[PDB]
Amino acid sequence: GMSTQYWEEEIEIMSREKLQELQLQRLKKTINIAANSPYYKEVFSKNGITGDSIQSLDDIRKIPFTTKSDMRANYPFGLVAGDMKRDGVRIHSSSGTTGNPTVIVHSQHDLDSWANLVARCLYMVGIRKTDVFQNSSGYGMFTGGLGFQYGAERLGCLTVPAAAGNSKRQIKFISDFKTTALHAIPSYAIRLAEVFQEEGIDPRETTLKTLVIGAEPHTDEQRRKIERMLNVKAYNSFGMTEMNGPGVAFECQEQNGMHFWEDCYLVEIIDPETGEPVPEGEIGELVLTTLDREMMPLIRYRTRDLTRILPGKCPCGRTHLRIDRIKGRSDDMFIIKGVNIFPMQVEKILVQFPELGSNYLITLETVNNQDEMIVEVELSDLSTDNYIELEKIRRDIIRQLKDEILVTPKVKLVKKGSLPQSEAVRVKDLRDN
């Protein structure tokens, strides 16, 4: 409380009364901006949403939800509200070519707001400009790459844009550049600790002090295991491309719930069936509204993420609400190696091969603390192909899947009728979650 340091004290410890008037002011502004987009112009016209519709924060429930299906239907720029040709500076797109992906368009204001939120998060968990920050997240279209890169530079850290994989090079950068802060997915942080002891280095005797872990569900125990293996303090990091990427919700040094930055987001916990707000503190679907986005704001977006608001004041002194861990989702999406994948993306690739049967199964397992994706697909007795030709097709399946879902899966061609029958195709998740 008294010894707690803040990036933006006036906002981070702002009274609930002053937070409510800030959210209402930014909510009205967001709706007036969003009304310029072809999608929300249509939505507001059909539901009688005008400039007088929002007088309180509860009036947001007059506006219907924004679903992923709606966003896919308006791909690529149906929800763009600003002047993209003049002020649009970046596009963040989701994976795929078999279906319409998700596109978020940002202006310079939007990138600066996002970079400030990431800097706020990093400063909160004790990271300073004197720290050496290494980002093991994939770059390019992945928001974790450029997101933490801009945020850590804004804070003033000596950044190490290592990007994904090559654990020996990751260990080399930590040892030679004296890395103190590291961003990694929980399973990769365990892999790095393992690679340290393979190279004859004690994973507890490095320059590492702080770890930022996210992109996928993990228990408090899995985080405590990471903390013991590397002799560090690990903090839960929440984000999604739709909400910028990282910097949305983050743990404080109390490591009890993730503080949601309510100055930039309006949080709603809704019953996934009725679509009504859940009783205070119960598990429901996370529904979010951007409050500082201008190029492409999102109003009441159904994230399909399940969580709850943790009650009571936090001893760090911050007034921004805390959410519990995200354990699962209300949709059919699965996360492997921190990458979001829909089972339809896999099916749309497999159906193109006439040598394959219709029956397929996706299995998610943990092998040596690392997550693996196994795609079993039955053979069609219609093919006249021998071993050499079928193996070439199996390698072509791996390659086309890798390009679509942005992860390399294990593909096994199984006997016709070997896989069990159910009748939508299920994803068998055998991981400890």
Farthest CA pair distance, the chain: 75
Query: Is position 163 an interface residue for a copy of itself (rule: CB under 8 A)?
Result: yes
Nearer to ligand AMP, 248 or 379 (CB): 248
Residue from 119, 152, 160, 185 binding ligand COA (CB under 6 A): 185
Breaks (C-N over 2.5 A) in the chain follow: 423
Residue from 316, 323, 326, 356 binding Zn ion (CB under 5 A): 316
Nearer to K ion, 28 or 304 (CB): 304
Min. distance of Cβ 395 from a copy of itself in angstroms? 16
Contacted entry of Zn ion, a copy of itself, K ion, none for residue 314, CB cut-off 5 to 8 Å set by kind: Zn ion
Residue from 3, 10, 86, 384 binding a copy of itself (CB under 8 A): 86
Query: Is position 259 an interface residue for ligand COA (rule: CB under 6 A)?
Result: no
Nearer to ligand AMP, 181 or 397 (CB): 181
Binding residue per annotation — 95? yes
Within 283-312, the residues that bind ligand AMP by CB under 6 A are 303, 305
Query: Is position 93 an interface residue for a copy of itself (rule: CB under 8 A)?
Result: yes
Query: Is position 343 an interface residue for ligand AMP (rule: CB under 6 A)?
Result: no
Binding residue per annotation — 167? yes
Query: Site size for Zn ion, by CB under 5 A?
Result: 5
Min. distance of Cβ 318 from ligand AMP in angstroms? 18
Query: Is position 14 an interface residue for Zn ion (rule: CB under 5 A)?
Result: no
Query: Is position 252 an interface residue for Zn ion (rule: CB under 5 A)?
Result: yes
Residue from 252, 329, 334, 405 binding ligand AMP (CB under 6 A): 329
Min. distance of Cβ 203 from a copy of itself in angstroms? 17
- Cα–Cα distance, 142 to 304 (Å, whole number): 20
Min. distance of Cβ 228 from ligand AMP in angstroms? 20
- Cα–Cα distance, 416 to 421 (Å, whole number): 12
The one-letter amino acid at 416 = K
On the 0-12 / 13-18 / 19+ scale of CB atoms within 10 A, 4 is middle
Nearer to ligand COA, 74 or 187 (CB): 187
Min. distance of Cβ 301 from a copy of itself in angstroms? 21
Nearer to ligand AMP, 96 or 245 (CB): 245
3-state secondary structure the chain: CCCCCCCCHHHHCCCHHHHHHHHHHHHHHHHHHHCCCHHHHHHHHHCCCCCCCCCCHHHHHHCCCECHHHHHHCCCCCCCCCCHHHHEEEEEECCCCCCCCCEEEEEHHHHHHHHHHHHHHHHHCCCCCCCEEEECCCCCCCHHHHHHHHHHHHHCCEEECCCCCCHHHHHHHHHHHCCCEEEECHHHHHHHHHHHHHCCCCCCCCCCCEEEEECCCCCHHHHHHHHHHHCCEEEEEEEEHHHCEEEEEEECCCCCCEEECCCCEEEEEECCCCCCECCCCCCEEEEEEECCCCCCCCCCEEEEEEECEECCCCCCCCCCCEECCCCEECCCCEEECCEEECHHHHHHHHCCCCCEEEEEEEEEEEECCEEEEEEEEEECCCCCCCHHHHHHHHHHHHHHHHHHHCCCCEEEEECCCCCCCCCCCCEEECCCC
Min. distance of Cβ 291 from ligand COA in angstroms? 30
Min. distance of Cβ 405 from ligand AMP in angstroms? 12
Nearer to ligand AMP, 241 or 345 (CB): 241
Residues that bind ligand COA (CB under 6 A): 136, 164-167, 185, 188, 191, 337-338, 407-408
Residues that bind K ion (CB under 5 A): 88, 129, 158, 215, 340
Residues that bind ligand AMP (CB under 6 A): 94-95, 143, 214-217, 236-241, 245, 303, 305, 326, 329, 335, 340
Which residues fall in the annotated binding site for Zn(2+)? Answer: 252, 259, 314, 316
Which residues fall in the annotated binding site for ADP? Answer: 95, 215, 236-237, 239, 241, 305, 329, 340
